[PDB]
Design an enzyme around this catalytic site. Structure first.
Site, PDB file in Angstrom:
ATOM      1  N   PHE A  59      35.165  34.279  39.233  1.00 25.45           N
ATOM      2  CA  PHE A  59      35.193  32.875  39.284  1.00 25.45           C
ATOM      3  C   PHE A  59      35.922  32.390  40.371  1.00 25.45           C
ATOM      4  CE2 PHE A  59      34.442  32.143  34.494  1.00 25.45           C
ATOM      5  CZ  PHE A  59      32.870  32.526  34.599  1.00 25.45           C
ATOM      6  N   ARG A  60      36.630  33.309  41.448  1.00 24.76           N
ATOM      7  CA  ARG A  60      36.695  32.968  42.966  1.00 24.76           C
ATOM      8  C   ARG A  60      37.955  31.897  42.949  1.00 24.76           C
ATOM      9  NH1 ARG A  60      34.157  37.533  44.370  1.00 24.76           N
ATOM     10  NH2 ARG A  60      32.049  36.813  44.874  1.00 24.76           N
ATOM     11  N   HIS A 168      36.308  50.357  39.514  1.00 22.98           N
ATOM     12  CA  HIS A 168      35.379  50.109  40.759  1.00 22.98           C
ATOM     13  C   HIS A 168      35.209  51.462  41.272  1.00 22.98           C
ATOM     14  CE1 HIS A 168      32.734  47.990  43.855  1.00 22.98           C
ATOM     15  NE2 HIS A 168      32.947  49.110  44.326  1.00 22.98           N
ATOM     16  N   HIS A 227      29.912  48.551  36.383  1.00 23.79           N
ATOM     17  CA  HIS A 227      28.776  48.863  37.004  1.00 23.79           C
ATOM     18  C   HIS A 227      28.487  50.095  37.353  1.00 23.79           C
ATOM     19  CE1 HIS A 227      31.440  48.709  40.505  1.00 23.79           C
ATOM     20  NE2 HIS A 227      31.649  47.171  40.246  1.00 23.79           N
ATOM     21  N   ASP A 302      28.804  41.009  36.363  1.00 23.87           N
ATOM     22  CA  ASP A 302      29.393  41.203  37.835  1.00 23.87           C
ATOM     23  C   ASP A 302      29.074  39.837  38.407  1.00 23.87           C
ATOM     24  OD1 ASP A 302      31.092  42.155  39.877  1.00 23.87           O
ATOM     25  OD2 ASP A 302      29.579  43.666  40.569  1.00 23.87           O
TER      26      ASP A 302
HETATM   27  N1  LIG Z   1      30.127  43.779  43.482  1.00 25.26           N
HETATM   28  C1  LIG Z   1      29.950  42.969  44.209  1.00 25.26           C
HETATM   29  O1  LIG Z   1      28.782  43.325  45.299  1.00 25.26           O
HETATM   30  N2  LIG Z   1      30.837  41.918  45.076  1.00 25.26           N
HETATM   31  C2  LIG Z   1      31.886  41.607  43.810  1.00 25.26           C
HETATM   32  C3  LIG Z   1      32.970  42.830  43.674  1.00 25.26           C
HETATM   33  C4  LIG Z   1      32.608  43.948  42.972  1.00 25.26           C
HETATM   34  O2  LIG Z   1      32.361  43.952  41.875  1.00 25.26           O
HETATM   35  O3  LIG Z   1      33.080  45.143  43.532  1.00 25.26           O
HETATM   36  C5  LIG Z   1      32.626  40.359  44.407  1.00 25.26           C
HETATM   37  O4  LIG Z   1      33.773  40.025  44.203  1.00 25.26           O
HETATM   38  O5  LIG Z   1      31.959  39.587  45.310  1.00 25.26           O
HETATM   39 ZN   LIG Z   2      33.238  46.327  41.359  1.00 25.24          ZN
HETATM   40 ZN   LIG Z   3      33.145  42.942  40.130  1.00 17.81          ZN
END
Ligand SMILES: NC(=O)N[C@@H](CC(=O)O)C(=O)O
Ligand SMILES: [Zn+2]
Ligand SMILES: [Zn+2]
Ligand SMILES: [Zn+2]
Ligand SMILES: [Zn+2]
Ligand SMILES: [Zn+2]
Ligand SMILES: [Zn+2]
Ligand SMILES: [Zn+2]
Ligand SMILES: [Zn+2]
Ligand SMILES: [Zn+2]
Ligand SMILES: [Zn+2]
Ligand SMILES: [Zn+2]
Length: 423
Positions: A59-60, A168, A227, A302
């Protein structure tokens, strides 16, 4: 409030009934034909499931032009998502207790859904404990700041704790080797640089350390692989689960790794660029079978919003990640309607398993806070990114016709309309 004419998932069957929610937001009574003097909403025999949990969103915080707690929680409501677990790769990354509680304060101010925060693990902070964190996120590649475990020799020490870790898993040394052999010229090159081997070798590295811990230690970590995208990593996890006695492993997959594959890379352009990247059709198939065989525990989005401006750049400048919190439920229900997974499979990976793994009580029981996702399983309609509430109003699934939409989202007793009540 009385929800009249529900088909409810309770325990593990479909029962017809009404749901009476008291004014504290708690389920007061579940019964057929409840007759009370109350506000009445006719659910018209739509399916009521325990509130969907999206265990993997971004959510940045600190980068609020991309998404914030308000827009992210409105997107969750729109997507039928009652609970979200937010990752710590912020600006700055959540690697200290103080940053955690400053972010938690902002979250409390404006989240309209139930949001939980994960803590970011570094080589320096990994023994620390943050009481209110749901899980501890390990990045095996660079993300932001020092939120990136560069020294894999420390993984045994990091993992040797009674903690829930999310990982991850991409292998930094495989990616570095590949960066010497391929130029980043077009979209398919992202898939070759972060290749299937880079995921598999990262998973192997974690597993090797868990076997040691399982034999030599009394700590019982829970490891959740984020993921997972490759058939080989799923096979290795299936195998090692038969060998481990004390350590639990759970597996998450995303909608884009189920639906999309690298033959689409040049057509999807930035909307197909994410980490880990697009894989083969055989990997898509393996992940779906893993849901049916119960090797895959949950689906999570994700949700990774970026500015449209940056996602339209060329492969070298295009950030990895797509939004997904508003498409995870329809894309999962769509698998039910295509006959690839069962309705109960979808409930398991969206609602029941994430609640067990992350200790979230979304159960439809008397006395519990009402956190409900209400779905029209058979509604056919187009995904339309202009109707997203996320700040990121774009998607690789834009324009897709699917079947199955959330129509209402109930957050601690408060009823909201969802995407399908505008379709
Ligand atoms: N998965 C992605 O491609 N991006 C995610 C980060 C992550 O889950 O590795 C992000 O925060 O932009
Ligand atoms: Zn990730
Ligand atoms: Zn992620
Ligand atoms: Zn009421
Ligand atoms: Zn009255
Ligand atoms: Zn906002
Ligand atoms: Zn556990
Ligand atoms: Zn083994
Ligand atoms: Zn493959
Ligand atoms: Zn830009
Ligand atoms: Zn720019
Ligand atoms: Zn049709």
């Amino acid at each position: 409030m009385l929800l009249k004419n529900c088909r409810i998932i309770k325990d593990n069957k479909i029962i017809e009934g009404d749901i009476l929610i008291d004014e504290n937001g708690r389920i007061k009574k579940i019964a057929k034909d409840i007759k009370v003097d109350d506000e009445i909403i006719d659910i018209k025999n739509s399916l009521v499931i325990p509130g969907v949990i999206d265990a993997h969103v971004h959510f940045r915080w600190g980068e609020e032009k991309k998404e914030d707690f308000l827009s992210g929680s409105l997107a969750g409501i729109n997507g039928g998502v009652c609970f979200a677990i937010d990752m710590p790769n912020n600006k700055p990354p959540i690697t200290t207790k103080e940053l955690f509680y400053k972010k938690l304060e902002d979250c409390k101010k404006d989240s309209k859904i139930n949001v939980f925060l994960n803590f970011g693990v570094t080589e320096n902070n990994y023994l620390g404990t943050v009481e209110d964190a749901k899980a501890y996120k390990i990045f095996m590649v660079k993300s932001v700041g020092d939120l990136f475990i560069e020294d894999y020799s420390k993984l045994k020490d990091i993992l040797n704790q009674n903690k829930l870790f999310c990982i991850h898993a991409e292998h930094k040394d495989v990616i570095n080797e590949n960066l010497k052999k391929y130029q980043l010229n077009s979209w398919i090159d992202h898939c070759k640089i972060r290749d299937e081997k880079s995921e598999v070798e990262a998973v192997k590295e974690v597993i090797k350390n868990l076997k040691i811990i399982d034999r030599q230690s009394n700590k019982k970590p829970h490891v959740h692989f984020c993921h997972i995208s490759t058939k080989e990593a799923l096979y290795l996890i299936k195998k090692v689960r038969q060998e481990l006695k004390n350590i639990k492993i759970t597996v998450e997959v995303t909608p884009h790794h189920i639906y999309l594959n690298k033959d689409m890379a040049e057509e999807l352009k930035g909307f197909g660029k994410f980490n880990p990247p697009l894989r083969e059709k055989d990997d898509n198939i393996a992940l779906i079978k893993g849901i049916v065989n119960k090797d895959v525990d949950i689906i999570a989005s994700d949700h990774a919003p970026h500015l449209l401006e940056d996602k339209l750049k060329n492969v070298k400048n295009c950030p990895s990640g797509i939004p997904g919190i508003e498409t995870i439920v329809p894309l999962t229900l769509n698998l039910v309607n295509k006959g690839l997974i069962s309705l109960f499979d979808a409930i398991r990976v969206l609602s029941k398993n994430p609640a067990k793994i992350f200790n979230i009580n979304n159960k439809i029981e008397e006395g519990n806070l009402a956190n409900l996702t209400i779905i029209d399983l058979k509604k056919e309609g187009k995904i339309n990114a202009e109707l997203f509430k996320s700040k990121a109003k774009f998607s690789p699934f834009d324009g897709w016709e699917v079947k199955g939409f959330p129509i209402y989202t109930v957050i601690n007793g408060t009823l909201y309309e969802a995407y399908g009540c505008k379709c």
